[PDB]
Design a protein around this ligand. Sequence first.
Ligand SMILES: [Cl-]
Length: 106
Amino acid sequence: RPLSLETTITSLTRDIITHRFIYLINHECIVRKLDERQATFTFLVNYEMKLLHKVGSTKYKKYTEYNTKYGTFPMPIFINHDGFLECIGIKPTKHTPIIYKYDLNP
Ligand SMILES: [Cl-]
């Protein structure tokens, strides 16, 4: 009846990527006028830190090597308001449909 990583990691992603997480990303996007490549980088830097802070080193290394192989780390969905990007949700994994900002935890 086992529980594989994909569930555990997606569950962590829902805990980490809150409204307050998106708030910070959206700020850096306007303040520093980032393109998609820069915003994505900033998005993943902040995800990886919050993940590491939550599960510590040994699990972090498990989950990152699991993502390299099965693409289980979230990707941001950005829209362009006139050269200023806004993150409006995430694809939690490769296989899972998008979650919009309105449906993320406060
Ligand atoms: Cl959904």
